[PDB]
C-alpha cells in the first residue's frame, strides 16, 4: 500500500561536484543566485533589488 508510506532519509553520502564559482549569496534577502547572471545584471540581486559591491573599473 503505497498510499501509506513513510519518508526514508536520502543517501547519507554521494559524491557530487558542482563547479565552485557559479553560486553566491545575498545576506539582504537570502536567495542564492547565479554568479554569471548577477554579473550580467550590474551586480544587482534580482530578487530583492539590493545593490552590492562593484569593481571601480
Amino acid at each position: 500500500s503505497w498510499i501509506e508510506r513513510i519518508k526514508s532519509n536520502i543517501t547519507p553520502t554521494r559524491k557530487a561536484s558542482i563547479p565552485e564559482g557559479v553560486w553566491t549569496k545575498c545576506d539582504s534577502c537570502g536567495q542564492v543566485l547565479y554568479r554569471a547572471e548577477l554579473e550580467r545584471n550590474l551586480e544587482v540581486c534580482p530578487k530583492c533589488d539590493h545593490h552590492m559591491r562593484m569593481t571601480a573599473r
Binding site: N9, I10, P12, I18, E20, W23, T24, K25, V32
Partner: protein, 77 residues
C-alpha cells in the same frame, strides 16, 4: 517546547570547520539569538538561528545527514 527547523535543504553539519567545536551543546541552555548548526548548500555554509530561549532538551539530528524544509533539528524547552 520549541524545535528549530532548517529553512533550506542540503548537507548538515555541526562544526563550522572540519576540525572545530560544535556551535551548541546538549544540556546547557541557549538564548534567542544564537547559531546552532550548519546546513550547507552548494558549498556555501549557512548558519541556523533559533528564536526562543530555553534549555536544550535534546538534539534530534546527527552530523552529515541531509535534512530538508520543516525538519525538526533541535528541541528547546
Amino acid at each position: 517546547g520549541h524545535i528549530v527547523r532548517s529553512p533550506m535543504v542540503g548537507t548538515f553539519y555541526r562544526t563550522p570547520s572540519p576540525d572545530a567545536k560544535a556551535f551548541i551543546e546538549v544540556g546547557q541552555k541557549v538564548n534567542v539569538g544564537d547559531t546552532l548548526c550548519i546546513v550547507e548548500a552548494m558549498k556555501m555554509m549557512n548558519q541556523i538561528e533559533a528564536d526562543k530561549s530555553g534549555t536544550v532538551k535534546a538534539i534530534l539530528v546527527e552530523s552529515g545527514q541531509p535534512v530538508e524544509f520543516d525538519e525538526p533539528l533541535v528541541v528547546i524547552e
